[PDB]
Design a protein around this motif. Sequence first.
Motif, PDB file in Angstrom:
ATOM      1  N   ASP A  10      40.013  37.422  34.528  1.00 57.50           N
ATOM      2  CA  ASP A  10      40.400  37.708  35.904  1.00 57.50           C
ATOM      3  C   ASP A  10      41.666  36.969  36.316  1.00 57.50           C
ATOM      4  O   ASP A  10      42.030  35.950  35.726  1.00 57.50           O
ATOM      5  CB  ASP A  10      39.262  37.342  36.862  1.00 57.50           C
ATOM      6  CG  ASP A  10      38.264  38.473  37.052  1.00 57.50           C
ATOM      7  OD1 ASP A  10      38.240  39.405  36.218  1.00 57.50           O
ATOM      8  OD2 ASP A  10      37.501  38.426  38.039  1.00 57.50           O
ATOM      9  N   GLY A  11      42.337  37.498  37.334  1.00 57.92           N
ATOM     10  CA  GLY A  11      43.522  36.865  37.873  1.00 57.92           C
ATOM     11  C   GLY A  11      43.186  35.530  38.503  1.00 57.92           C
ATOM     12  O   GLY A  11      42.214  35.414  39.249  1.00 57.92           O
ATOM     13  N   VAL A  88      32.609  35.460  40.743  1.00 63.47           N
ATOM     14  CA  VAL A  88      33.039  36.820  40.448  1.00 63.47           C
ATOM     15  C   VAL A  88      33.772  36.898  39.107  1.00 63.47           C
ATOM     16  O   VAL A  88      33.680  37.909  38.410  1.00 63.47           O
ATOM     17  CB  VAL A  88      33.951  37.378  41.570  1.00 63.47           C
ATOM     18  CG1 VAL A  88      35.187  36.504  41.754  1.00 63.47           C
ATOM     19  CG2 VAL A  88      34.343  38.826  41.282  1.00 63.47           C
ATOM     20  N   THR A  89      34.489  35.838  38.737  1.00 63.43           N
ATOM     21  CA  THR A  89      35.245  35.861  37.489  1.00 63.43           C
ATOM     22  C   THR A  89      34.302  35.793  36.291  1.00 63.43           C
ATOM     23  O   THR A  89      34.614  36.328  35.229  1.00 63.43           O
ATOM     24  CB  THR A  89      36.275  34.711  37.396  1.00 63.43           C
ATOM     25  OG1 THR A  89      35.605  33.450  37.259  1.00 63.43           O
ATOM     26  CG2 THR A  89      37.176  34.691  38.629  1.00 63.43           C
ATOM     27  N   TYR A  90      33.152  35.146  36.456  1.00 56.38           N
ATOM     28  CA  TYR A  90      32.144  35.146  35.400  1.00 56.38           C
ATOM     29  C   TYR A  90      31.422  36.487  35.363  1.00 56.38           C
ATOM     30  O   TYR A  90      31.081  36.990  34.294  1.00 56.38           O
ATOM     31  CB  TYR A  90      31.125  34.021  35.581  1.00 56.38           C
ATOM     32  CG  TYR A  90      30.064  34.043  34.504  1.00 56.38           C
ATOM     33  CD1 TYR A  90      30.389  33.775  33.180  1.00 56.38           C
ATOM     34  CD2 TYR A  90      28.743  34.353  34.802  1.00 56.38           C
ATOM     35  CE1 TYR A  90      29.430  33.805  32.184  1.00 56.38           C
ATOM     36  CE2 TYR A  90      27.774  34.382  33.812  1.00 56.38           C
ATOM     37  CZ  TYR A  90      28.127  34.109  32.505  1.00 56.38           C
ATOM     38  OH  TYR A  90      27.172  34.140  31.516  1.00 56.38           O
ATOM     39  N   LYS A  91      31.192  37.062  36.539  1.00 58.07           N
ATOM     40  CA  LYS A  91      30.543  38.365  36.649  1.00 58.07           C
ATOM     41  C   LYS A  91      31.346  39.459  35.944  1.00 58.07           C
ATOM     42  O   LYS A  91      30.786  40.469  35.519  1.00 58.07           O
ATOM     43  CB  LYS A  91      30.338  38.724  38.125  1.00 58.07           C
ATOM     44  CG  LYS A  91      30.037  40.195  38.393  1.00 58.07           C
ATOM     45  CD  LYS A  91      29.710  40.435  39.861  1.00 58.07           C
ATOM     46  CE  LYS A  91      29.698  41.918  40.203  1.00 58.07           C
ATOM     47  NZ  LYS A  91      31.048  42.541  40.056  1.00 58.07           N
ATOM     48  N   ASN A  92      32.653  39.251  35.819  1.00 57.94           N
ATOM     49  CA  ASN A  92      33.537  40.231  35.190  1.00 57.94           C
ATOM     50  C   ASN A  92      33.758  39.985  33.701  1.00 57.94           C
ATOM     51  O   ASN A  92      34.397  40.795  33.034  1.00 57.94           O
ATOM     52  CB  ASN A  92      34.891  40.249  35.899  1.00 57.94           C
ATOM     53  CG  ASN A  92      34.837  40.950  37.239  1.00 57.94           C
ATOM     54  OD1 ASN A  92      34.165  41.971  37.391  1.00 57.94           O
ATOM     55  ND2 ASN A  92      35.544  40.404  38.219  1.00 57.94           N
ATOM     56  N   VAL A  93      33.239  38.874  33.186  1.00 60.89           N
ATOM     57  CA  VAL A  93      33.365  38.555  31.763  1.00 60.89           C
ATOM     58  C   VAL A  93      32.832  39.691  30.884  1.00 60.89           C
ATOM     59  O   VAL A  93      33.484  40.070  29.911  1.00 60.89           O
ATOM     60  CB  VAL A  93      32.639  37.225  31.422  1.00 60.89           C
ATOM     61  CG1 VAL A  93      32.376  37.090  29.923  1.00 60.89           C
ATOM     62  CG2 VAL A  93      33.455  36.047  31.924  1.00 60.89           C
ATOM     63  N   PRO A  94      31.651  40.243  31.219  1.00 58.55           N
ATOM     64  CA  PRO A  94      31.140  41.375  30.433  1.00 58.55           C
ATOM     65  C   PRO A  94      32.088  42.568  30.408  1.00 58.55           C
ATOM     66  O   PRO A  94      32.121  43.292  29.413  1.00 58.55           O
ATOM     67  CB  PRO A  94      29.837  41.740  31.146  1.00 58.55           C
ATOM     68  CG  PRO A  94      29.413  40.497  31.827  1.00 58.55           C
ATOM     69  CD  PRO A  94      30.675  39.799  32.231  1.00 58.55           C
ATOM     70  N   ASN A  95      32.841  42.772  31.485  1.00 57.03           N
ATOM     71  CA  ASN A  95      33.786  43.881  31.546  1.00 57.03           C
ATOM     72  C   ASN A  95      34.986  43.649  30.632  1.00 57.03           C
ATOM     73  O   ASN A  95      35.407  44.556  29.913  1.00 57.03           O
ATOM     74  CB  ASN A  95      34.262  44.106  32.982  1.00 57.03           C
ATOM     75  CG  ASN A  95      33.144  44.552  33.908  1.00 57.03           C
ATOM     76  OD1 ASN A  95      32.207  45.231  33.487  1.00 57.03           O
ATOM     77  ND2 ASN A  95      33.238  44.173  35.177  1.00 57.03           N
TER      78      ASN A  95
END
Lengths: 205, 127, 13, 994
Positions: A10-11, A88-95
């Motif tokens: 993530d940014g 949120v940046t951890y939540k997007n790790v799977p993506n």
Amino acid sequence: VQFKLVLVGDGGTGKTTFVKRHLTGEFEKKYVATLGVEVHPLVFHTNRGPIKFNVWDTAGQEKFGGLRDGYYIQAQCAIIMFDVTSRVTYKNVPNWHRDLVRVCENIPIVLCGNKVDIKDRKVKAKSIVFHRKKNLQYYDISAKSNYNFEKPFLWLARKLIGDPNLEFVAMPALAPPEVPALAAQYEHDLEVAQTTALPDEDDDL
Amino acid sequence: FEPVTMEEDEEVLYKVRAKLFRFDADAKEWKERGTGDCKFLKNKKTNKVRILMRRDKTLKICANHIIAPEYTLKPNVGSDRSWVYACTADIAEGEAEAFTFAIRFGSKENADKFKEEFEKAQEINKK
Amino acid sequence: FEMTEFNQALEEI
Amino acid sequence: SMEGILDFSNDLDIALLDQVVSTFYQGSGVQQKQAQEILTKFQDNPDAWQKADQILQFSTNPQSKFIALSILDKLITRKWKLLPNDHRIGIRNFVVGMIISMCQDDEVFKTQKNLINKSDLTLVQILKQEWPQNWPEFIPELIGSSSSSVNVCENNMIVLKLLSEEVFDFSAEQMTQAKALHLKNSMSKEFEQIFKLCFQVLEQGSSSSLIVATLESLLRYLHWIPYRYIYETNILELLSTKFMTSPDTRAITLKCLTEVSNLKIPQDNDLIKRQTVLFFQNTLQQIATSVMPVTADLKATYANANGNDQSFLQDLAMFLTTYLARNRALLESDESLRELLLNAHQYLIQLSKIEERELFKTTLDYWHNLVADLFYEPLKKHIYEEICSQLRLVIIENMVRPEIQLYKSEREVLVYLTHLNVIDTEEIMISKLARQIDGSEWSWHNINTLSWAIGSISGTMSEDTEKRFVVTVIKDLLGLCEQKRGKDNKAVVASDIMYVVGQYPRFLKAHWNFLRTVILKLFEFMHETHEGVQDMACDTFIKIVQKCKYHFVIQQPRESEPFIQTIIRDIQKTTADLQPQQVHTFYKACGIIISEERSVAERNRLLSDLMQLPNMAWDTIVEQSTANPTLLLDSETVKIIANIIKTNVAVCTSMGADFYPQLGHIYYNMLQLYRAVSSMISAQVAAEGLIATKTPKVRGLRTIKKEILKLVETYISKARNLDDVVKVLVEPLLNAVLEDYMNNVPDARDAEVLNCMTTVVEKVGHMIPQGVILILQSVFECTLDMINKDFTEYPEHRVEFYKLLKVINEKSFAAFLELPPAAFKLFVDAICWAFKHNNRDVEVNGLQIALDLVKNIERMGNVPFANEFHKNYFFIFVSETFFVLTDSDHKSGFSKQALLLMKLISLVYDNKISVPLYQEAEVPQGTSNQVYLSQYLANMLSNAFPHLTSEQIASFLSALTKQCKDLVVFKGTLRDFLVQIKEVGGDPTDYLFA
Ligand SMILES: Nc1nc2c(ncn2[C@@H]2O[C@H](COP(=O)(O)OP(=O)(O)NP(=O)(O)O)[C@@H](O)[C@H]2O)c(=O)[nH]1
Ligand SMILES: [Cl-]
Ligand SMILES: [Cl-]
Ligand SMILES: [Mg+2]
Ligand SMILES: [Zn+2]
């Protein structure tokens, strides 16, 4: 003897800051969003000779995404970055992992939780478990305090070279040389240097 | 029954933990260059003393130059535990280049001791 | 780093 | 020259494209960077997709075709339904045909997996748009084509894998609820045919690449398919035997069986229980015979890191822990299954020895699940007696430093294990200690590890057993210290001795004479120059005190006075060699003890005696400092002053409300000092400029100010007598700090002022309405002007600012009512400004202030101020909230944004806004706010999102407004909306999902 490394996340998670630290030793305080990608050669000295990482530091913000997963082609290793102060940046790790392994089916990957130097940690250690089933190596890191900042490259070096005993070693220190009309030039630059305060004067060092 | 770093030619005069900065005049900003042990190394052949400093963990060289007698340690405006001085030939990153360095220490005491050793080393390079 | 006082206090029970 | 491809008026030169692409991937430096920017500009062209057919046909560069598919992907995802229907069919057939041709060429299929996988993903994007409503024959035709070619069959498994992922694993927050359900039902309805194909491939063999691709797809299916497909077929047999033998299929198979263990299964069927046992039995069988025996050294194997051994052992750990956490009860009764149960756990023991932090944490979580169960569940622990015994050694030998999460986890397991068998635990630890003495296992790390382990189980044994145990350990450690030579070795052991005793307070409490000797020894160590010893001594001192404070405040039978008095008498001598920070910890520890004295007269006397040194130093300073204000320029005087205040902070931290008498002793002179220091800072900035703030001189001065603020904050936050706070402390404080803050230049303002004020308002804000008004007047506007030009400057002031507004809005809302209209307008602007921060410290408070503000206004009822608020600021809050909701740059605050919006919308649909929110001109007289709200929002969204149809907006708002009482559904509708604004032609009926 070089390897392509893609760095995603993530940014604002500190990808560019992390690489900059390894390149020059500086800590960049400002957030200048990466546009698409920046490629940076990064060499380490090991007991197995020098190893070179071609680091593809990609953009985390979608509006600056560029070629996106196009950057991943023929990558031989990767780092996924997130921010332990931002859930949120951890939540997007799977993506990020998804888009990554679809292009790179079998490569060593390190998951990094950055900014552990900050007191009010939001992504607690016990809840970080995504790496387990995906066989990713995980490290708490801090680009600011240099906590574990070398671990990701050391682990990747060991995997890529195929030697679990690979170690970073001290590069050779050549004898430095001894040393005009530029006595006024340096005195100018030096005057400005003294009157510009050193940053982070409250730090331990 | 038959059984089954280019600095070891030198002497460590002084060693101290420190943080090294380089001055980016274009941005008018101090940029960190490395943190680790700063060593004064005396060549056993030439008796010339140099500064050698390495980054922790990576052990990459972030300072390598002779402690020239021409150099002068100045105080930084915002610190009582740092020294600022111009360097005309540092080979840490490869080719000899000039820098305006700043080095900070754990305390004013370590800073004053550094300057003492620094000037001691200058007198040795003075022969 | 001697600690004879510790033993004496321990042996006292 | 490379920038030629960016000219779409001319025909695209494929040769030129490939050169640009190669220059990017295989090139370097400036040419690479230039090619990079050219390629981005190319694919970002909204007409680039039209030239995709050219590339995929005439190009010889796989990376160019990859980029072509990316361009197509972007089109299908966002503008698919906008295309002419002919283009949709054309793109489809082009993608299908391209995939078919690549599969028929064994050369291409073998050497371009990347381009094919990308083409497959692109096909899946089309399916998400077109299937099954406009492509009902996809799955039938897929199954048909699979029987003809092996390559096509394998690729179909990849397409079905990707399809399952996009529908079930990654559909949330990528498609609307309605769209997700539609596709889930569609896949669900035709899975019977898919599974049949899948099972046939697996059973009939025999291409490794085909089997693996099929198993990889099966892994995805297991996330959602009903359990019958797994238990009412022979597939568990194939997984647990056939595919565990070949290493190619072993990895994926093990992952499948792990997920199989997580399937939803009825717990009453005895046959299913046997099937669950059976595939476990088969799997462990194959591992023992085909991979490695239970006796194997997995630590060594993992370390060697040959091939995929590390990944396999990771996967084995996940499989064993997953299955056993859920099903081990199935193995505990049947005596014929005991060998299986213990072998499975013996593998876990061996895995637990591997040197790999994250893997150890995985196994440790399982061990916790087990020993906790053995602690509570009757007739279980005897089964695992040999497993538990090995586990004790494994955990003791890998104990980590307490300082932390891993240590606490290790402690919990080891405490359980000690309860389960105290005798065995003691034996292992003493034995381990013996091997430290004979030198066979001696090291600095090893003695520390053992000490931490021994310390972790305190309070688990009986007091009598503990006493016997502790004594034996200290004796052995004492003898170990004498044995060693050199301070380095002696220092490590001595520190460990102090660590253990500090961990056994129950023992210390029962034996005063020993406790006294311990403390006295720590005092001796406070003089030890050896690195780390002094820190160790102080940390142990306060640690022991926290737990044994009562034994310091009372008179022990063999003593004349409470020991706290003795400590204070020699406090100068005891702390003479300590650094300032270490002295403060010492004083803090003394304050903990003094607080336990409930006799007020005695407590205050002890307090006075403790603070004797700092108070004398203080009195001497106040005399010298005021007579000659130049003294403060002296760095030594500034340091002395700072340390005196810090000592007061330290003691106040542990004494809280009891500290008041000491505060009153210094209070008025302290605030006078605050003023004097303030003048000097200002004078210095005037004479040297802003750079002065960076100098050691001024930073030293500001430290005094900050520590004074911290001391006052610390006391007030813990004060019990608020009348005294209000009537004695507040007025002098405000007069001392507010004007100074307001009239300093921005770089000289201390954010600590805002923090201190936050605590003042928090504890006594309700009692000083005039005081709160004065606070706002002095800090509100001038602080806002510091932080309202960007999101970066003055970060500390930024956070403290909104924390202060928050508590004022909570405790003294009247203060905002007294603001002039122009200032109340800045207050609103400030709140919305907080919404737009990415910095969550600011964002969350911003949203909360907004929410609480609306509530405050609501409680006022139908009055002129509340009415004028809604007229002026209601639609500002609605629109500003909507903006951060939809701009994709504040996804972190979605939940609180939704709550705020729901609250705003509910006000109108409950008719709680008495006055009309519109002008009598723009809307006919009599129109409800409800109708006007819909119009305003419909118009707002139309202009903000012009690519939406009026029907979408109308349906969205219709759903949103009638769901404004149910937050979970409300949020669902918002998320559906956030999906639809990312594409064209979204279905407006999606908003009828609830
Ligand atoms: N406290 C702290 N801040 C950090 C750390 N690492 C990076 N930062 C800060 O985070 C901000 C963003 O850093 P940056 O490297 O640009 O992140 P990025 O992932 O490259 N962003 P993008 O993907 O948009 O290019 C910077 O202000 C940086 O100083 C850290 O370890 N600790
Ligand atoms: Cl797994
Ligand atoms: Cl470990
Ligand atoms: Mg970046
Ligand atoms: Zn399948």
